[PDB]
Structure formats: C-alpha cells, structure tokens
C-alpha cells in the first residue's frame with residue numbers, strides 16, 4: 001500500500017495473510033469461518049500446494065501476540081475462464097482445512113448479494129484497500145498492516161483519465177478502476193488478493209480484490225480490482241459443494 | 255423499488271409484484287419490525303468491527 005496509514009490492530013479483522021513455505025505470498029478476505037476470497041494470479045507459480053497457509057488476526061509480522069490463527073488451505077478454486085499470466089477473472093476461493101475461531105481480531109467481511117452490490121455498493125465512492133505490500137514502488141514491504149481509502153471510477157472515466165501507453169490490457173466487465181493518477185496512493189503487487197471493502201449503513205462488504213496495475217502508484221495509472229459482484233453466484237454454489245481430492249480446483253465459470 | 259435508495263433497506267432488497275418490496279439480511283442478522291433495519295443475532299456478525307462497536 002502506497003500513501004496510506006497503519007490499520008489500527010483489530011480494525012481490518014477480515015484481512016488474511018497468505019504464506020507459501022512461510023514466505024509472504026498474497027492477501028485475502030475471510031467471508032465466513034471456512035472460506036477466504038483471494039486473487040487467482042497469487043497461485044500461478046505454486047509448486048507444492050501443501051505449504052500454503054492462511055493467517056487471520058495478523059497485524060505485525062515481526063511479533064507473535066497470540067491473536068494470530070494459522071490454517072492450512074485445503075482447496076484453491078479458480079474459474080475455468082482465468083488464464084495464468086493474464087488479467088481477466090482474477091479471483092480464487094480458498095477452503096480452510098479447519099475453521100478459524102471468530103474473536104475481536106478475526107471477523108468475516110460480508111460477501112454481498114449481486115443485486116445489492118451492483119445497484120447500491122457500486123455507487124459508494126470510497127472504499128478501503130489493505131495489505132502488507134510495498135510501501136513504495138521498488139521499496140520494502142510493510143511490517144504492520146496498512147490501509148488506504150480509494151475512490152471508484154466508472155470504466156469510461158478510468159480510460160479517459162489514464163496515460164496513453166502501448167500493450168496495456170483492457171478493463172473488462174469483470175474489473176473496475178480505483179485510486180489516483182498522481183502517483184501518490186495505490187495498492188501494490190504484495191497487496192494482491194486483498195480486500196477492497198465498502199461501507200454501507202454501518203456494515204462493510206466485499207466489493208473488489210487487489211488485482212493488477214502497472215508499477216505501484218505510477219503517474220497516469222489507477223489500480224485495477226476484480227469486480228466481486230460478477231462472481232457472487234459462482235462463489236455461493238462452490239461454498240455449498242463437497243471438498244474434492246487435490247488442492248487446486250478449476251471450476252466452470254459462469 | 256429496490257433500484258432507488260436500496261428500497262430503503264439497510265441490507266438486501268427483493269422486488270415483488272407491483273409496489274411490494276421485501277428487505278432481507280445477511281446470515282447472523284435479523285430484520286426488525288420496521289421491515290428495513292438489520293440487527294446482529296450473533297457475537298461476531300460479518301462486516302462489523304468489534305473494537306469500534308464496543309467503543
């Protein structure tokens with residue numbers, strides 16, 4: 001996260017930290033005691049699916065304070081339409097091997113209904129994006145969880161406010177832009193998979209997933225987020241399914 | 255009705271025949287008699303921050 005602030009301990013209780021062999025991989029969002037929503041691109045290079053751990057209740061990476069809860073990831077579900085190394089359909093649904101225990105420091109974010117998300121949440125200007133990603137472009141990652149407030153843009157407006165650069169991927173209906181073009185504030189690659197959370201009438205909802213962009217907080221460029229509203233039905237059906245042997249599961253989308 | 259100001263609902267909105275509207279709530283919440291408000295039914299309802307709620 002570039003240009004934000006430390007999220008006070010316990011104020012982003014749905015934030016997940018994903019680790020591979022104990023190393024920082026990505027962010028995620030807890031949506032109930034068993035399931036986490038992350039980005040598909042996070043898993044492009046996984047070789048040993050058994051060393052993937054989700055940590056809830058995390059805040060400071062240099063110290064164990066007892067609020068952290070670690071779980072093995074039993075399943076990683078990616079839409080069949082996602083192609084590794086590309087941008088579209090950048091979402092993953094992870095099933096924890098054992099549920100996390102909800103406490104003051106571990107609480108799920110609401111996965112909203114599609115209607116509610118498209119007709120109401122999509123019009124809330126500002127949302128919070130969080131993670132332990134880069135504090136600067138080509139800089140060190142954060143030790144304490146960072147959070148940043150970003151405005152959402154209409155896709156026509158994102159394309160009219162963006163700097164004309166070649167070979168740039170398109171912004172599909174499974175994405176949305178959010179942030180600033182002045183190079184001061186953005187989410188980064190190390191925040192990938194993290195929540196873009198929207199407040200409405202006293203409750204927070206999952207609206208986006210930290211997905212892609214070009215170099216963190218680059219002038220003329222906004223962050224690009226997975227449009228979670230497009231996947232509600234796909235996620236709800238999978239959450240009602242029985243686990244399957246093997247960690248990785250490619251599921252048909254739609 | 256649901257398309258304008260979320261049909262007055264705090265959370266979810268379902269449109270029905272004519273001008274009929276039903277508000278609904280995410281799991282861990284119950285709908286109040288006003289037909290619009292949602293109240294927690296569990297200790298840790300989704301999307302609520304306990305350290306801020308307890309303050």
Ligand SMILES: Cc1cc2ccc1[C@@H](C)COC(=O)Nc1cc(F)c(O)c(c1)CN(C)C(=O)[C@@H]2Nc1ccc2c(N)nccc2c1
Pocket residue numbers: 041042043044045085086087090169186187188189190192210211212213214215216217222223224
């Ligand atoms: C999907 C993706 C992801 C990123 C960069 C490019 C792409 C597409 C085009 C090609 O696809 C990839 O590069 N895929 C890909 C696969 C992997 F396994 C990776 O480890 C990695 C990326 C590392 N990496 C650079 C990433 O995660 C990076 N994330 C963000 C996330 C949020 C960003 C933001 N808000 N403002 C600026 C930059 C940002 C970069």
Ligand SMILES: [Ca+2]
Pocket residue numbers: 058059060061062063064065068
């Ligand atoms: Ca810690």
